[PDB]
Amino acid sequence: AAPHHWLLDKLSGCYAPRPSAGPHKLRESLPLIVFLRNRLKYALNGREVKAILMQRHVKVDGKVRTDTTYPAGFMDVITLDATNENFRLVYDVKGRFAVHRITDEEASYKLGKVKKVQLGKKGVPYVVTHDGRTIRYPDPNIKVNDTVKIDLASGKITDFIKFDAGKLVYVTGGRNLGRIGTIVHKERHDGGFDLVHIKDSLDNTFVTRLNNVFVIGEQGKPYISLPKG
């Protein structure tokens, strides 16, 4: 009854935890019970993960948010107070949620793909992201599928990454879900299979969608740290 992304062992139970509503969707997130209890194993059961949630160790996106099924989606920096645990969780190359450990100056921010820019009411420019941070007043040159950098103390955009040909992009969606390498090709079609294409070890080619891909930095310099093997 589980998805593939959670890295959930089959010998666990019968009812799978539906995440509650929140920032991200159901299909692109993992809740805190499947995060803490059975992935990096700070708990043994739902009772004691509710106990540490009542103790309020979790500090995801700089706020506490004491809830069992809180849908932590892409790169919400899970922060735990004891042993200064800073966790940025991204996608691995085979579809799961690889939770990388980072440090404090990297967990002081996150980034987010812009979805739409609106002239909503009363002359106010407007920007949303995958956690829905409706932050005030970016520059006019925010296209769709660019990348804002959230402040995580206040909410303001601090840095901006422009989407164009020659940018380091992350793909979350479809049969390319979780690949990095961002350059063999660029092809913007007019309604589907439109993208920037991603290399491999032998620099192979790949096809995805615009909304299923979003930028993380430059060719060699992302200010996100990434795990390795």
């Binding site: 007043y137 970016p138 520059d139 006019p140």
Partner: protein
């Protein structure tokens, strides 16, 4: 009752002096972005 009449009015004028000033305080940042653009 009257102490609540003190605190209600004080929190109301403080809410005004926070919100209605902060709104123009980021509208001026929009003005800086528009001047630089």
């Amino acid at each position: 009752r009257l102490q609540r009449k003190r605190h209600q009015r004080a929190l109301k004028v403080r809410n005004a002096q926070a919100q209605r000033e902060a709104a123009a305080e980021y509208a001026q940042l929009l003005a800086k972005r528009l001047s630089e653009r």
